[PDB]
Symmetry: C3
């Protein structure tokens, strides 16, 4: 099935944020047996390896924005690699790496499927512009570079001349929000972007959140779905090994429910698994809990159902 035909891309990149270690995300996700577990559930999996992001040593900040050329070039290469995977009729699976990479992942995916809709699972909106940001970390700005409605508000940052906004504000849905800066809240509300913060998830329940999310993105017409999954969208009791953890998050059950429902549309076309940092647990078990949770979420996007799965054969007459 095309919903189980996958193209794996390793994106060992950390310069979109200050905490070292997130570049090992692809390594620890592979070592948990991701590819093998995907093959076990009938997927046709091709591994495109890890991108060799060459060093960009002269990389002065753009105002307070750190490592602009390195973040820009990593997303530039990733966009080219994602477009290649999409051209091969495979769902792109990007193993991160920090979430600044979503600029490239979504941009490359859009080059092949410009009609795509985005589901962004995260505790954060990642919609600060290079002028509204206070940290200067590019992993908290990817959505700003991608929105067409923000054209005019994104300055000329070195390394990003290749970026052309590819998604309208109406074609993205946030799920999991609980730590939004004032400037980000002003943008979210002014643009009228569809969102389900932890307050909406608490009000409606995840069942209704997904029914509304899929109706919002697929109601006018069926189109490719890009899911950008930041592991910090889940509560730190399931994904502690991440750089910006926030209490009161999505449960392990809610994360599986989101991805099971996205699988069943048959429209998943691109997936990002972002912000796994195996240098940031309090214990080695906290790292293993985080990686196992990310693998579990990944398997659900490609058909693993909690009710069970079976091949089309008579199990009572083998």
């Amino acid at each position: 099935a095309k919903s189980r035909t996958i193209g794996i891309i390793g994106a060992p990149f950390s310069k979109g944020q200050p905490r070292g270690g997130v570049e090992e995300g692809p390594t620890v996700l592979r070592k948990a047996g991701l590819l093998e577990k995907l093959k076990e559930q009938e997927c046709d999996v091709k591994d495109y390896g890890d991108l060799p992001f060459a060093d960009i040593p002269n990389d002065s900040p753009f105002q307070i924005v750190k490592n602009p050329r390195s973040v820009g070039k990593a997303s530039e290469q990733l966009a080219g690699k994602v477009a290649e995977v999409k051209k091969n009729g495979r769902i792109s699976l990007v193993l991160g790496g920090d979430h600044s990479l979503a600029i490239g992942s979504i941009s490359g995916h859009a080059r092949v499927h410009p009609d795509l809709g985005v589901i962004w699972v995260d505790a954060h909106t990642d919609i600060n512009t290079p002028l509204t940001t206070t940290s200067g970390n590019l992993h908290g700005q990817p959505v700003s570079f991608l929105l067409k409605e923000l054209k005019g508000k994104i300055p000329d940052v070195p390394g990003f001349s290749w970026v052309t906004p590819c998604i309208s504000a109406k074609d993205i849905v946030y799920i999991g929000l609980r730590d939004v800066d004032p400037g980000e809240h002003y943008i979210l509300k002014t643009l009228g972007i569809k969102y389900f913060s932890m307050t909406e998830v608490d009000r409606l329940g995840i069942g209704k959140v997904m029914e509304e999310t899929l109706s919002y993105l697929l109601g006018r017409k069926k189109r490719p779905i890009h899911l950008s999954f930041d592991v910090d969208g889940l509560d730190p009791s399931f994904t502690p090994a991440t750089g910006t953890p926030v209490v009161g998050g999505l449960t392990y059950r809610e994360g599986l429910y989101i991805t099971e429902e996205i699988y069943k549309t048959g429209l998943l076309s691109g997936l990002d698994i972002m912000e796994v940092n195996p240098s940031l647990g309090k214990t080695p078990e906290e790292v293993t809990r985080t990686v196992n949770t990310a693998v579990a979420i990944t398997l659900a996007c490609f058909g693993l159902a909690r009710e069970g799965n079976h091949k089309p054969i008579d199990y009572l007459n083998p």
Copy 2:
């Protein structure tokens, strides 16, 4: 009240599965004050004791299926004891022990009340047949022995010729599923069995799960209910001391909700509290947490309500 008139049956049996310690389930449940706590809650408790499961020498496997004679005999004895409790007008409360004992518990309950409905709370369907199983552990097969529709698909397994399938596929509702084998999922779907996996619980909420579960089993008219509760249906953060824990389970609150709703029907007729294994708690606190949760679940089955309880007297005069 008949909804609080109970017959306790200890079933210290572990040979339906490979991890030692589940035979201590009745001991640690009694040690935690279960019978005394039920009496304090206005229950009429009769203790039928702990079943003596005599060892069977040379219990050779049936193909890959382990301890068939032992499992079959323990369920045979349990069926006879449960039928005895039901004839005395009591709700049978089986303290397990591994889940293979549900063959005996449901069979004995059906000998007295053939029209019963089964609510099966578990991370697992336990519906592998002696032929579809890959572990050979009989605690993962009890539902296959009881189902009328699988008659002709279960081979002649030594120790089980006394079993007469007593439940139709329409008469069972699963709640809690999240770890189902391919063969098991094939059976669940081809039989059309009603189930609320963790996916349905997330989608609907436990309130709707119970409303649909009870409307499905009781729609037509009142009928006895058998609740078979594997403690692994709850998330391992509440019941860690169990052999097959699966994360993303029912919460402690959801477990109390299901049992409080079943109590309110006034139709609870048979109860199994299964898979408590005090040798699998990583700390003595993990053991106590599991035992405390299993006790809380059982008390809710016989009337303990979170909103409060009171006798029909005036507390202000």
Copy 3:
């Protein structure tokens, strides 16, 4: 600042309503955590009214089995006057406890200025034992019985409580979070027909529906002042372990924030009580900080802090 974010802080370091020492350090640890400064960061107009000085009463004989009756009654008497004064200044009273016996004073004082108020009681417990139905004798499990007009006749004359005049009827109080109710309390709750949402109702409906029904019940006819009395033991002990009577199976951190965010949105919050935080009952220092941080998060959510974000009325893209 908006009326919804115009606050009067009252510290109530009182512990004689229950037997465990340390709940008197509740107002200190909440302030030490940066509470008042965090409220100012949220556009709040905060005026601190200080910690009430509670005098020692060494000749405080028990009323039958009821412990420290004069000390508890006088503590609540001092608080009713201080709450009524904050209400007269057009501010939302924010009472930092201290044990829940203080709710007699907080609600009594609030009712002196706004007698039409409605109460939302977030707790694992009903706290509706009367001095005759109580088995422990601890007044922190009896405040609601002293406040109800329907119980005028069943409450004996307890020393230190003559000033109390019941101000709320059974129709004016909604409980949320109930999971440990004595038999006498359950009899009172069901005979008075009080609206409640125990953990069973929260599981059945979800916190979304619990709040929609709660607010429709209390506000639906006419808009009125809300008094939120919040016992931290309402939330599960995985979030608020540093408390005297923890009960498992509680409200989550998310449900706590959902209740308070929804109450803020009404724009009618008039009085608030953050009760039973006992920093001496933490098994580890981590459990104490967790309970304090959670109490702080619930408090900020009552005054505008929203999980979806907050922003000033300025253009952030061209300021």
